Amino acid sequence: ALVKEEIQAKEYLENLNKELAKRTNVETEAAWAYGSNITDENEKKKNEISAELAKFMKEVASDTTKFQWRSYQSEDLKRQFKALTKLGYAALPEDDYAELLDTLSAMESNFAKVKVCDYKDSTKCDLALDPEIEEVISKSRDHEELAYYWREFYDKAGTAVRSQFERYVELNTKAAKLNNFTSGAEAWLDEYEDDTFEQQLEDIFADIRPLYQQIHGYVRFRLRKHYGDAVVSETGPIPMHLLGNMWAQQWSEIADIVSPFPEKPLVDVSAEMEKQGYTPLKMFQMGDDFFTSMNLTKLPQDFWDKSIIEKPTDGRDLVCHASAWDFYLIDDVRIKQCTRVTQDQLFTVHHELGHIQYFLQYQHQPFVYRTGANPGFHEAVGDVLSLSVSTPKHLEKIGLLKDYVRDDEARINQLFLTALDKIVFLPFAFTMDKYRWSLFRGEVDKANWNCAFWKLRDEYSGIEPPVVRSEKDFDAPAKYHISADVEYLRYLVSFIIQFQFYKSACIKAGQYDPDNVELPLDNCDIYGSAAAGAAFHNMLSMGASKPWPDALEAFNGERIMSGKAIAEYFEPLRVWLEAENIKNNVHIGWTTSNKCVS
Ligand SMILES: *[C@@H]1O[C@H](CO)[C@@H](O[C@@H]2O[C@H](CO)[C@@H](O[C@@H]3O[C@H](CO[C@H]4O[C@H](CO)[C@@H](O)[C@H](O)[C@@H]4O)[C@@H](O)[C@H](O[C@H]4O[C@H](CO[C@@H]5O[C@H](CO)[C@@H](O)[C@H](O)[C@@H]5O)[C@@H](O)[C@H](O)[C@@H]4O)[C@@H]3O)[C@H](O)[C@H]2NC(C)=O)[C@H](O)[C@H]1NC(C)=O
Ligand SMILES: *[C@@H]1O[C@H](CO)[C@@H](O)[C@H](O)[C@H]1NC(C)=O
Ligand SMILES: *[C@@H]1O[C@H](CO)[C@@H](O)[C@H](O)[C@H]1NC(C)=O
Ligand SMILES: [Zn+2]
């Protein structure tokens, strides 16, 4: 029976993968229509088609049991079957599935439709997060103005969806258990195919946490000099509204007030981008150029024809959170980005285009393999290029950085600037999933859900709200990914492995040699490197056809996720900063926040 059955199973899979790709195409189109144009009608259509695809996946899961697939010889066939067994939310009874979709829609559309009143004009009430509130949070140094916008946003994006969030947790848990996972934490973790993955991240995080603490201490010190001791204490958590970002996830927008060497250059090319007439289209064309310069795949015409690369002016509601979309045919790939002409946005364009590249590289795989080796791989691709794009080397080459002298002090300024994004984010990203996992696993009583969030943000990041919160507030959904039910550990994983990829690409490009002071890792530009491009091609073309260690091995010969490379990048900063904090008697660490009343 078995040899013959395995022949038939191969044909079964060939056909089923093609059918899933086509059916997924159709759900993806409806989701795109909604996300690009939020209306009740588009919501209904998206959710109806999802319900129908879920019912089909339920039949597929049932049909896998007609095959003795665990008995087969082919590791590849077994891997595909195992992927089709995994229903996720589709395991839910029809009515629960529909209720979950309705709940998700309610949260994501609440987030996307938030508007607040101008701090200086309570009749102007059409300020959205993107761009209006984000511009104040990144540019204002009026601490009361900042606190105002923080409070208005969190109250509307967060607290307003407590009820919905609670029902989502219940249904997410019910779904996980129907897949025989303990909870949605274990369902998310299953994507890393590694039963020690959490311990591995704890270990890496513990190794980098000392450096974070040094950065935190120095920033707090600098913020005290700017705002004074009535606004920032020496010993307490940093008030998060002063850190240049609504979620304090990255602190690079306050670099001009905390840079190590204020009289030496600090890279900020936004003003030159504007002066040279950059547009969203040009920024996308330049990202395309980067990839094609490395001998990777050019964007196809569908990308240009169907992407939305600037915020519509017609007053519609949409999701502006930047995203990359695979339509599961051939070359139908798209970005939806409310693009602004800034340095940070140039990096975001490259990030999104890394997802597009991945889609193009794996599009010949069977449907079940048309995804990242793990979710962190997907998020890392474009960041590897952004690391290069951010270098003084690259930015001088493209005419955006003028009259730059790369002395020791400018190098520390640039390392610090990078760390304000790359090191600061690590505890932030860990807490987003630690929080959700703790709710999913039933470890926090509902009475303590809000303070459990702020407790994690305190313990790991040493930040706190600008105002006292309580269990009357519900703050976690004020972060897009929490309202949108997007797993966050992918970004922690990305921020570690992107340095492994960057280092290896730099070495292949001839742009990094640890023994050559002329080739430091932090000034490596892989632009134009076919050797780097080759490593990407070898890895990305695999999709999810093999466990992620095999995909890393295809890139650089390694099989282990490791903090060595990110530490190697920041090692000169670590040395300098440890010394600077001692020299300035900077207090390190923080007392427990008083800003969430239990
Ligand atoms: C999550 O875990 C769940 C368990 O906690 C699991 O649910 C179990 O799935 C089992 C596998 O499908 C299912 O097993 C069948 O049980 C039937 C009897 O069940 C009743 O009594 C139970 C308790 O006594 C009740 O709780 C149930 O509700 C039922 O009322 C059996 O009749 C049935 O049998 C047939 O199938 C076996 C297995 O066949 C296999 O494949 C080939 C077929 O060619 C076999 O040759 C091979 O060796 C293998 O056995 C045949 O041997 C047999 O001849 C029959 O055709 C079968 O044992 C079980 O009932 C169910 N239990 C519970 C408690 O729910 C979920 O499936 C898991 N979910 C996921 C997503 O993995
Ligand atoms: C948005 O969707 C609605 C359907 O609810 C449709 O009538 C309208 O034309 C769409 N607008 C745009 C900008 O596509
Ligand atoms: C570019 O990529 C192609 C296809 O992957 C390969 O055959 C070729 O050798 C590469 N060219 C360069 C510039 O190395
Ligand atoms: Zn991404």
Residue numbers in the entry: 17 to 614
The authors write:
Angiotensin-I-converting enzyme (ACE, EC 3.4.15.1) is a promiscuous zinc metallopeptidase with a number of substrates, including the vasoregulatory peptides angiotensin I and bradykinin, the anti-fibrotic agent N-acetyl-SDKP, the neurotransmitter substance P, and amyloid-β peptide. Here, we present the use of the Drosophila melanogaster ACE homologue, AnCE (which, in particular, shares enzymatic properties with cACE), as a model to study the structural basis of ACE inhibition. The active site is located at the centre of this channel, marked by the location of the catalytic zinc ion, which is coordinated by His367, His371, and Glu395.
Due to ambiguity in the electron density maps, WR-1 was modelled in dual conformation in the non-prime subsites. In the first conformations, the arginine faces towards the S2 subsite, and the tryptophan sits within the S1 subsite, whereas in the second conformation, the dipeptide is flipped. In the first conformation, the arginine carboxyl group coordinates the zinc ion through a water-mediated interaction, whereas in the second conformation, the dipeptide distance from the zinc ion is too far for coordination. The observed Fo-Fc density makes a strong case for both conformations of WR-1. The WR-2 dipeptide was modelled in a single conformation; however, for this dipeptide, the side chain density is less continuous. As the WR dipeptide is the weakest binder out of all the dipeptides tested (Ki = 0.84 mM) in this report, the low occupancy would not be surprising. The arginine of the WR-2 sits within the S2′ pocket and forms H-bonds with Gln266, a hydrophobic contact with Phe441 and Phe511, and a salt bridge with Asp437. This binding also causes Gln266 to move (relative to the apo structure) in order to accommodate the arginine side chain within the subsite. The change in binding conformation of WR compared to the other dipeptides appears to be highly driven by the backbone interactions, in particular the carboxyl group, which occupies the polar pocket within the S2′ subsite. Out of all the dipeptides tested in this study, WR shows the highest Ki value for AnCE 840 µM (0.84 mM); this partially matches the findings of the study by Lunow et al., which showed that WR has a significantly higher specificity for nACE than cACE.
